[PDB]
Amino acid sequence: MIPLQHGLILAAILFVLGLTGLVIRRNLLFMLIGLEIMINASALAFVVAGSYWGQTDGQVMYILAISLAAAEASIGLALLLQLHRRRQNLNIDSVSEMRG
Amino acid sequence: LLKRDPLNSMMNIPAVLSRFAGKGLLLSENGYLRWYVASMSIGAVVVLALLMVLR
Amino acid sequence: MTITPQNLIALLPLLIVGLTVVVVMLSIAWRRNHFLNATLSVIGLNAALVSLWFVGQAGAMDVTPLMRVDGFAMLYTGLVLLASLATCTFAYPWLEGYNDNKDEFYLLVLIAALGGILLANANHLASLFLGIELISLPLFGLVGYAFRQKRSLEASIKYTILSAAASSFLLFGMALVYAQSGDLSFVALGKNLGDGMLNEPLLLAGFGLMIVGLGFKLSLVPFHLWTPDVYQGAPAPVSTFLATASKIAIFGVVMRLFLYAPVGDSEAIRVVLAIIAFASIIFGNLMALSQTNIKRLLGYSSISHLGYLLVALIALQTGEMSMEAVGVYLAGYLFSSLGAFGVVSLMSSPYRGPDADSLFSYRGLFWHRPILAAVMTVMMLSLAGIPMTLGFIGKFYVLAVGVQAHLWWLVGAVVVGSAIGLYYYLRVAVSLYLHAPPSNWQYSAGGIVVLISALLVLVLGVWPQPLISIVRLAMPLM
Amino acid sequence: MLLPWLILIPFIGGFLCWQTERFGVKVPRWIALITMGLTLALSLQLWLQGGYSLTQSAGIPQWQSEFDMPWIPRFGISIHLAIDGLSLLMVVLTGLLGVLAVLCSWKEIEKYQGFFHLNLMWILGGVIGVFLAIDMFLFFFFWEMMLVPMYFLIALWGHKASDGKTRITAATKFFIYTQASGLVMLIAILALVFVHYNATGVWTFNYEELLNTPMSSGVEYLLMLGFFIAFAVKMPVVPLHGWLPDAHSQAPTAGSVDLAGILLKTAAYGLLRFSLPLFPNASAEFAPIAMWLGVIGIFYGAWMAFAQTDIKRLIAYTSVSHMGFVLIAIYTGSQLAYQGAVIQMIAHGLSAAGLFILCGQLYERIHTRDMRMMGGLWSKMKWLPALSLFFAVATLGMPGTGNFVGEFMILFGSFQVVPVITVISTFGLVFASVYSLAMLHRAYFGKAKSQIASQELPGMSLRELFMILLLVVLLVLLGFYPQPILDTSHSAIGNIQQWFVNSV
Ligand SMILES: CCCCCCCCCCCCCCCCCC(=O)OC[C@H](COP(=O)(O)OCCN)OC(=O)CCCCCCCCCCCCCCCCC
Ligand SMILES: CCCCCCCCCCCCCCCCCC(=O)OC[C@H](COP(=O)(O)OCCN)OC(=O)CCCCCCCCCCCCCCCCC
Ligand SMILES: CCCCCCCCCCCCCCCCCC(=O)OC[C@H](COP(=O)(O)OCCN)OC(=O)CCCCCCCCCCCCCCCCC
Ligand SMILES: CCCCCCCCCCCCCCCCCC(=O)OC[C@H](COP(=O)(O)OCCN)OC(=O)CCCCCCCCCCCCCCCCC
Ligand SMILES: CCCCCCCCCCCCCCCCCC(=O)OC[C@H](COP(=O)(O)OCCN)OC(=O)CCCCCCCCCCCCCCCCC
Ligand SMILES: CCCCCCCCCCCCCCCCCCCC
Ligand SMILES: CCCCCCCCCCCCCCCCCCCC
């Protein structure tokens, strides 16, 4: 007796919060954090949809989503460590040399 | 009065407009990643608002 | 649904590419050998390409609740495999100058090709999502393969962050679509709606968010701003793969999704896609007017050509030759981009360190590299859609499909964008012949690949009937 | 039968010109000469064996020869060639101008002369294919195909005294104009084919099958507008004209490129062959706009030609004014005006070829084209100012030259149809006399206005004089005896006119 709309609304709120954190933060680490919030919110939306329909497909899509989240976190933190090694800062606005 | 071929310049007007529009559109390619994310979210808002308007 | 031996025969290029991934991985674990591992990768890709024949005589079937193998999937599998083989061929002379490990490049190329094959066969939201990320993450590695170079690290970071954001958008849209529909197969997206109630708001919102993710993946306006930076910063064989295989595979799965989904017949989705295609054509052509960099120019070119492809996609539910137009256009665009990016890769190879710039300087190329200059001017005329080239046959198909479906705004957009493209493509082609102030068989193999692409572009430009018959032979399930 | 060889002998000859440069630097010019002589001989053989003077008008279609082969059977696209009197006259003119273009570039001993000759041969083959193709897709294919060698010739082999960037700008403007207009024509062709397919069910691009296509009024107007936009760019019709003076200015100094494709008039042929028979009602409704555009073209071209300090640009705007006359003739629906238009196209080709060859040799002698830096050149040269006087006298429409026969039959038929446009056009002939006299006064009469014009100049070569005198003889014979030309085109013109006025 939990409405499907309430779970989808919670997932949407978390998604837009993660996207806001991705946009407003100059740090690459907080950008990766916001990306993790976004993908976890989308996976929660899939879980809510699967639980409404009584199917394992929502949890299977959750499993694929968190596999993607783990591998993307790995690659993003590797690139962040490379950036910190070769520039000694995590300012994403400084990484802007290609333009026009 | 006609020695500069005014009709030729009138037909060259679209090329000038195309160059100006291309220069104006190249301002969005400033190379900033946060602006690219912001433009993605702007496009998401525009697409979703258009879909709810035309439904 | 279970898996039969006939289903295993329909699985053949996926199984062969995955086995090649495992075999190349174990060969790298045995001993680091650039030549042997590159040879094993290209042998596996060629084996998948020739196993497409056994796939064809297996017939069209449904292999999983997730995959569907038919002539459509065969054509896109062949295109993805050709792009991957060309990427490996261009990658070897570039990696000859690479100081760090070179063997992981081919592993990433093979995994991305596996993702392209999965997207070719994808009949499901799960397989579409998995194929997109299986393309994207090896491209995170490949775009930043020369991470010591500043531009490659910049392109890698931008591509990784923006592709993760688009993946989140796509998955949230898929979740909303699944909440509306209750099934993740393509044919069931909108099947629970009747009496003119196809425009359900949650289904439309979900498809809009998937449109955001896929339009990032297809460099479509307004999710296009990453394209010149990532195309410029990536290594040139990676730019070749990113221009051809990723775009072709994602457009093929988008073609199949909009063919099979009943919500693909929605008017609002059609108008939104028409707006995106119009803006993509005009913006991509306008933004390449004043580019002195060949890689950024080719990125804006990719935006325009994907706009033309989207115009062909919009008329899918109305016309009958829309997917045949898409196949012909994608074959021509693949060969033209292979030639152009391969000439760029051959002139950028070997990799001359991270502290030395990889600037092209195409001016006066004919006076030291005449064959490469001829190939590149053939590709510039092909990308402009000039007759006697296959790009014109693709543009003709797009225009015929647009005229059939009375999409007059998109037709005018194609004409205007073609004129603007004519300007900058001819500028590059004539700059090749002005005046400005290798030695191994793998470089010669890359030159052979770009020369064969130029010959194919010319021959199918004057005689396109074999390609048309092949594309019409690749009929998906109705 | 011989029509595919009429197209293919230029292409094979151009390939042989490119390939046989290894045997010598003076070899490809002989190959190009043999190629265009063979093409001209085949065209004259078709003229002799066709029996065009005895052919009566039997209605469209009526082809004296026809060739068919499947090219793209999925769309119903064929390599489909057909020749009748008007097409034969245009093909003979193309072959003669190709021979003149080969002979005009005889002394160029450049390291890449073979590619120059290949581009020239491919332009000539494309023009012949435009005149021969009666398949809509093949016609469009040749129409756009002959623009790439012209682009590369203008951009790379062009006027060497000017900067490179001016040559690339002129070539780019010409290519963009012609190819964008061609794309609009392609849209019109595609929509006509789709209307015919929805009314019949048959995939065809054959112009014979598309003649009987039921269209609504307004759809036919738009298809006619697309066709007319392409033809008006390449006629030229004002204001889609400036590419022509910019392309003539930056063409190579010999003038072979001027004779090859910039001067042959495929657009008036396309208007007569395709625009009027496919869309007769739309053309009849468009006729006032088209003849007023022709009037504006006549007077604008005359005023522009008077205002030029460049002699080449003067000749280009002269061509603009003459094409305004022909455009008026096409939309009258008169047999006399159509025959005058045919004579006027042939006479303009001959006279503009003579003017451009003489301008190229004048630039060879004096190394400038500004008329303010020359003057009094009658006393300095042996042959050139007198022949330039003859050709300028021809282009103002002197009787005894074919230009008079053309423009006066045009004006007779037009006055039979529309008198006001005719009287305004005859005052355009007064304007033509004004600009021709102005060019003659500024170039060859008076005193020398610089140092290079005050010195004696070397005489013309025997080959150059031979082909200029050949053009002089042909223009005089067209002026005094135009009846073979009128009899050759009589049946095709009659078919087009009867189709135009019997369906309106
Ligand atoms: C278990 C299930 C089935 C699995 C798949 C089938 C078995 C796979 C076996 C893979 C074996 C990998 C190791 C091969 C070692 C070859 C050693 C050799 O001869 O090396 C010579 C050369 C080395 O490189 P180079 O620098 O030229 O050396 C100069 C010094 N002589 O190297 C060369 O010149 C290149 C020699 C290439 C030899 C192998 C060619 C065939 C490879 C077949 C497998 C590829 C993937 C197949 C995918 C499925 C197809 C259905
Ligand atoms: C009868 C009217 C209605 C039907 C029209 C049908 C279309 C065909 C006939 C009209 C064609 C008009 C073309 C006008 C532009 C010609 C191209 C040109 O001028 O290119 C040269 C110019 C570069 O030279 P420059 O000025 O030196 O540049 C300095 C920059 N560093 O290049 C540039 O500056 C950039 C050029 C960009 C591309 C050209 C402009 C395209 C505009 C749309 C084309 C399609 C037509 C749509 C209708 C337009 C209005 C009539
Ligand atoms: C930027 C340069 C290019 C210009 C922009 C691109 C082209 C724009 C073309 C706009 C066309 C607007 C048509 C508006 C009416 C559509 C609805 C309609 O009336 O449909 C009627 C008919 C369908 O009904 P049906 O039973 O087939 O009747 C047969 C009628 N013959 O419909 C049909 O049969 C099909 C009608 C097709 C009409 C011709 C379309 C192309 C014409 C050539 C190009 C446009 C005109 C020239 C260029 C303009 C200036 C640039
Ligand atoms: C980057 C910016 C710059 C570059 C881009 C610039 C703009 C490019 C696009 C310009 C063209 C826009 C579209 C023009 C075509 C519009 C067609 C139209 O409105 O059609 C409506 C109607 C359709 O016919 P309908 O009445 O439905 O027929 C069935 C029953 N009779 O039509 C009719 O009934 C007949 C209508 C005829 C008049 C409309 C067409 C005008 C064409 C103007 C150009 C040509 C002018 C004439 C020739 C000049 C010299 C070449
Ligand atoms: C009279 C009642 C009945 C009406 C009949 C029609 C009008 C009759 C007019 C007769 C008089 C015309 C006189 C023309 C003189 C031309 C010669 C001349 O003066 O030449 C000087 C100048 C030389 O130019 P240039 O070659 O550059 O020389 C270098 C330096 N001098 O050359 C120039 O500057 C060029 C001069 C060009 C003159 C053009 C004249 C056009 C006449 C059009 C008549 C239209 C009639 C209808 C008008 C509208 C009615 C509603
Ligand atoms: C329209 C389809 C393609 C047509 C052919 C395009 C060109 C292909 C390459 C052919 C060889 C080019 C040689 C150019 C030599 C230029 C020499 C200039 C000297 C000033
Ligand atoms: C397409 C090229 C046209 C060139 C101009 C031709 C002009 C016509 C010349 C015809 C021959 C005139 C002189 C001979 C008259 C012979 C009379 C024969 C009947 C008795």
mmCIF file with all atom_site columns, C-alpha atoms in Angstrom, chain C residues 129-223:
data_model
loop_
_atom_site.group_PDB
_atom_site.id
_atom_site.type_symbol
_atom_site.label_atom_id
_atom_site.label_alt_id
_atom_site.label_comp_id
_atom_site.label_asym_id
_atom_site.label_entity_id
_atom_site.label_seq_id
_atom_site.pdbx_PDB_ins_code
_atom_site.Cartn_x
_atom_site.Cartn_y
_atom_site.Cartn_z
_atom_site.occupancy
_atom_site.B_iso_or_equiv
_atom_site.pdbx_formal_charge
_atom_site.auth_seq_id
_atom_site.auth_comp_id
_atom_site.auth_asym_id
_atom_site.auth_atom_id
_atom_site.pdbx_PDB_model_num
ATOM 1  C CA . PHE C 1 129 ? 21.532 -0.150 -21.920 1.00 0.00 ? 129 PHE C CA 1
ATOM 2  C CA . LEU C 1 130 ? 24.249 -2.805 -21.650 1.00 0.00 ? 130 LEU C CA 1
ATOM 3  C CA . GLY C 1 131 ? 25.348 -2.338 -25.265 1.00 0.00 ? 131 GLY C CA 1
ATOM 4  C CA . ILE C 1 132 ? 25.587 1.426  -24.809 1.00 0.00 ? 132 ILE C CA 1
ATOM 5  C CA . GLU C 1 133 ? 27.838 1.109  -21.768 1.00 0.00 ? 133 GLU C CA 1
ATOM 6  C CA . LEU C 1 134 ? 29.830 -1.731 -23.347 1.00 0.00 ? 134 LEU C CA 1
ATOM 7  C CA . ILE C 1 135 ? 30.599 0.714  -26.143 1.00 0.00 ? 135 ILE C CA 1
ATOM 8  C CA . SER C 1 136 ? 31.163 3.702  -23.853 1.00 0.00 ? 136 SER C CA 1
ATOM 9  C CA . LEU C 1 137 ? 33.555 2.455  -21.152 1.00 0.00 ? 137 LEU C CA 1
ATOM 10 C CA . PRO C 1 138 ? 36.264 1.013  -23.455 1.00 0.00 ? 138 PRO C CA 1
ATOM 11 C CA . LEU C 1 139 ? 35.987 4.365  -25.218 1.00 0.00 ? 139 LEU C CA 1
ATOM 12 C CA . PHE C 1 140 ? 36.727 6.022  -21.864 1.00 0.00 ? 140 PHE C CA 1
ATOM 13 C CA . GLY C 1 141 ? 39.941 4.026  -21.907 1.00 0.00 ? 141 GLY C CA 1
ATOM 14 C CA . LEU C 1 142 ? 40.738 4.551  -25.578 1.00 0.00 ? 142 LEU C CA 1
ATOM 15 C CA . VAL C 1 143 ? 40.044 8.305  -25.684 1.00 0.00 ? 143 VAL C CA 1
ATOM 16 C CA . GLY C 1 144 ? 42.432 8.730  -22.771 1.00 0.00 ? 144 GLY C CA 1
ATOM 17 C CA . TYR C 1 145 ? 44.914 6.072  -23.831 1.00 0.00 ? 145 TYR C CA 1
ATOM 18 C CA . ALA C 1 146 ? 47.681 8.684  -24.088 1.00 0.00 ? 146 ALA C CA 1
ATOM 19 C CA . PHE C 1 147 ? 46.771 10.170 -20.710 1.00 0.00 ? 147 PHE C CA 1
ATOM 20 C CA . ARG C 1 148 ? 50.220 11.764 -20.421 1.00 0.00 ? 148 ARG C CA 1
ATOM 21 C CA . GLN C 1 149 ? 49.148 14.010 -23.296 1.00 0.00 ? 149 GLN C CA 1
ATOM 22 C CA . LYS C 1 150 ? 47.148 16.942 -21.954 1.00 0.00 ? 150 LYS C CA 1
ATOM 23 C CA . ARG C 1 151 ? 44.468 16.988 -24.672 1.00 0.00 ? 151 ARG C CA 1
ATOM 24 C CA . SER C 1 152 ? 43.837 13.242 -24.394 1.00 0.00 ? 152 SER C CA 1
ATOM 25 C CA . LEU C 1 153 ? 43.330 13.500 -20.627 1.00 0.00 ? 153 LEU C CA 1
ATOM 26 C CA . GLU C 1 154 ? 40.976 16.463 -21.154 1.00 0.00 ? 154 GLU C CA 1
ATOM 27 C CA . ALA C 1 155 ? 38.952 14.537 -23.740 1.00 0.00 ? 155 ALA C CA 1
ATOM 28 C CA . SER C 1 156 ? 38.862 11.434 -21.525 1.00 0.00 ? 156 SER C CA 1
ATOM 29 C CA . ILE C 1 157 ? 37.589 13.359 -18.498 1.00 0.00 ? 157 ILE C CA 1
ATOM 30 C CA . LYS C 1 158 ? 34.952 15.203 -20.543 1.00 0.00 ? 158 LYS C CA 1
ATOM 31 C CA . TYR C 1 159 ? 33.750 12.040 -22.293 1.00 0.00 ? 159 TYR C CA 1
ATOM 32 C CA . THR C 1 160 ? 33.629 10.031 -19.053 1.00 0.00 ? 160 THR C CA 1
ATOM 33 C CA . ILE C 1 161 ? 31.681 12.634 -17.056 1.00 0.00 ? 161 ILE C CA 1
ATOM 34 C CA . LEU C 1 162 ? 29.226 13.467 -19.840 1.00 0.00 ? 162 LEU C CA 1
ATOM 35 C CA . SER C 1 163 ? 28.676 9.824  -20.786 1.00 0.00 ? 163 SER C CA 1
ATOM 36 C CA . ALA C 1 164 ? 28.006 8.893  -17.156 1.00 0.00 ? 164 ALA C CA 1
ATOM 37 C CA . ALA C 1 165 ? 25.478 11.749 -17.003 1.00 0.00 ? 165 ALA C CA 1
ATOM 38 C CA . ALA C 1 166 ? 23.810 10.584 -20.222 1.00 0.00 ? 166 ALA C CA 1
ATOM 39 C CA . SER C 1 167 ? 23.777 7.008  -18.904 1.00 0.00 ? 167 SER C CA 1
ATOM 40 C CA . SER C 1 168 ? 21.972 8.209  -15.771 1.00 0.00 ? 168 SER C CA 1
ATOM 41 C CA . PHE C 1 169 ? 19.456 10.094 -17.937 1.00 0.00 ? 169 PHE C CA 1
ATOM 42 C CA . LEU C 1 170 ? 18.926 7.038  -20.145 1.00 0.00 ? 170 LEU C CA 1
ATOM 43 C CA . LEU C 1 171 ? 18.447 4.672  -17.201 1.00 0.00 ? 171 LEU C CA 1
ATOM 44 C CA . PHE C 1 172 ? 15.999 7.033  -15.482 1.00 0.00 ? 172 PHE C CA 1
ATOM 45 C CA . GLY C 1 173 ? 14.018 7.249  -18.717 1.00 0.00 ? 173 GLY C CA 1
ATOM 46 C CA . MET C 1 174 ? 14.033 3.458  -19.051 1.00 0.00 ? 174 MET C CA 1
ATOM 47 C CA . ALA C 1 175 ? 12.793 3.165  -15.464 1.00 0.00 ? 175 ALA C CA 1
ATOM 48 C CA . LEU C 1 176 ? 9.926  5.595  -16.126 1.00 0.00 ? 176 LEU C CA 1
ATOM 49 C CA . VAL C 1 177 ? 9.046  3.699  -19.322 1.00 0.00 ? 177 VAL C CA 1
ATOM 50 C CA . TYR C 1 178 ? 9.094  0.400  -17.402 1.00 0.00 ? 178 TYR C CA 1
ATOM 51 C CA . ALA C 1 179 ? 6.902  1.910  -14.675 1.00 0.00 ? 179 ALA C CA 1
ATOM 52 C CA . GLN C 1 180 ? 4.359  2.886  -17.322 1.00 0.00 ? 180 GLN C CA 1
ATOM 53 C CA . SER C 1 181 ? 4.461  -0.258 -19.455 1.00 0.00 ? 181 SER C CA 1
ATOM 54 C CA . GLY C 1 182 ? 5.479  -3.167 -17.231 1.00 0.00 ? 182 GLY C CA 1
ATOM 55 C CA . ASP C 1 183 ? 7.672  -4.857 -19.840 1.00 0.00 ? 183 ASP C CA 1
ATOM 56 C CA . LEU C 1 184 ? 11.131 -3.914 -21.088 1.00 0.00 ? 184 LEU C CA 1
ATOM 57 C CA . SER C 1 185 ? 10.897 -5.437 -24.568 1.00 0.00 ? 185 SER C CA 1
ATOM 58 C CA . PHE C 1 186 ? 10.784 -2.978 -27.457 1.00 0.00 ? 186 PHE C CA 1
ATOM 59 C CA . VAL C 1 187 ? 7.417  -4.142 -28.826 1.00 0.00 ? 187 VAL C CA 1
ATOM 60 C CA . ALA C 1 188 ? 5.641  -3.632 -25.481 1.00 0.00 ? 188 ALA C CA 1
ATOM 61 C CA . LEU C 1 189 ? 6.520  0.064  -25.018 1.00 0.00 ? 189 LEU C CA 1
ATOM 62 C CA . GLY C 1 190 ? 3.069  1.550  -25.467 1.00 0.00 ? 190 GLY C CA 1
ATOM 63 C CA . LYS C 1 191 ? 1.175  -1.697 -26.085 1.00 0.00 ? 191 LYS C CA 1
ATOM 64 C CA . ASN C 1 192 ? -0.992 -1.203 -22.971 1.00 0.00 ? 192 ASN C CA 1
ATOM 65 C CA . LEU C 1 193 ? -2.564 1.951  -24.459 1.00 0.00 ? 193 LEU C CA 1
ATOM 66 C CA . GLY C 1 194 ? -5.538 2.171  -26.795 1.00 0.00 ? 194 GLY C CA 1
ATOM 67 C CA . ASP C 1 195 ? -8.266 4.419  -28.219 1.00 0.00 ? 195 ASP C CA 1
ATOM 68 C CA . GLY C 1 196 ? -5.822 7.183  -29.113 1.00 0.00 ? 196 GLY C CA 1
ATOM 69 C CA . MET C 1 197 ? -4.207 7.348  -25.650 1.00 0.00 ? 197 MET C CA 1
ATOM 70 C CA . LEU C 1 198 ? -0.683 6.597  -26.905 1.00 0.00 ? 198 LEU C CA 1
ATOM 71 C CA . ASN C 1 199 ? 0.662  9.910  -25.548 1.00 0.00 ? 199 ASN C CA 1
ATOM 72 C CA . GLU C 1 200 ? 0.791  8.844  -21.916 1.00 0.00 ? 200 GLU C CA 1
ATOM 73 C CA . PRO C 1 201 ? 2.797  11.458 -19.956 1.00 0.00 ? 201 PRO C CA 1
ATOM 74 C CA . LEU C 1 202 ? 5.030  9.021  -18.052 1.00 0.00 ? 202 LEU C CA 1
ATOM 75 C CA . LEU C 1 203 ? 5.900  7.014  -21.167 1.00 0.00 ? 203 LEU C CA 1
ATOM 76 C CA . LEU C 1 204 ? 6.637  10.246 -23.038 1.00 0.00 ? 204 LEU C CA 1
ATOM 77 C CA . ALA C 1 205 ? 8.807  11.565 -20.188 1.00 0.00 ? 205 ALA C CA 1
ATOM 78 C CA . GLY C 1 206 ? 10.734 8.302  -20.075 1.00 0.00 ? 206 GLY C CA 1
ATOM 79 C CA . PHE C 1 207 ? 11.256 8.348  -23.827 1.00 0.00 ? 207 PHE C CA 1
ATOM 80 C CA . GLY C 1 208 ? 12.359 11.979 -23.568 1.00 0.00 ? 208 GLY C CA 1
ATOM 81 C CA . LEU C 1 209 ? 15.050 11.102 -21.038 1.00 0.00 ? 209 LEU C CA 1
ATOM 82 C CA . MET C 1 210 ? 16.186 8.194  -23.214 1.00 0.00 ? 210 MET C CA 1
ATOM 83 C CA . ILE C 1 211 ? 16.213 10.674 -26.115 1.00 0.00 ? 211 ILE C CA 1
ATOM 84 C CA . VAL C 1 212 ? 18.546 12.839 -24.008 1.00 0.00 ? 212 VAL C CA 1
ATOM 85 C CA . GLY C 1 213 ? 20.926 9.927  -23.432 1.00 0.00 ? 213 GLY C CA 1
ATOM 86 C CA . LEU C 1 214 ? 20.849 8.649  -27.010 1.00 0.00 ? 214 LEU C CA 1
ATOM 87 C CA . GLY C 1 215 ? 21.177 12.156 -28.440 1.00 0.00 ? 215 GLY C CA 1
ATOM 88 C CA . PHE C 1 216 ? 24.291 12.562 -26.371 1.00 0.00 ? 216 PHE C CA 1
ATOM 89 C CA . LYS C 1 217 ? 25.488 9.287  -27.861 1.00 0.00 ? 217 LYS C CA 1
ATOM 90 C CA . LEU C 1 218 ? 24.618 10.439 -31.403 1.00 0.00 ? 218 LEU C CA 1
ATOM 91 C CA . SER C 1 219 ? 26.072 13.986 -31.008 1.00 0.00 ? 219 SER C CA 1
ATOM 92 C CA . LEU C 1 220 ? 22.617 15.452 -31.606 1.00 0.00 ? 220 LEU C CA 1
ATOM 93 C CA . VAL C 1 221 ? 21.784 19.059 -30.712 1.00 0.00 ? 221 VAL C CA 1
ATOM 94 C CA . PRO C 1 222 ? 21.594 20.102 -27.859 1.00 0.00 ? 222 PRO C CA 1
ATOM 95 C CA . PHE C 1 223 ? 23.693 17.212 -26.514 1.00 0.00 ? 223 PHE C CA 1
#
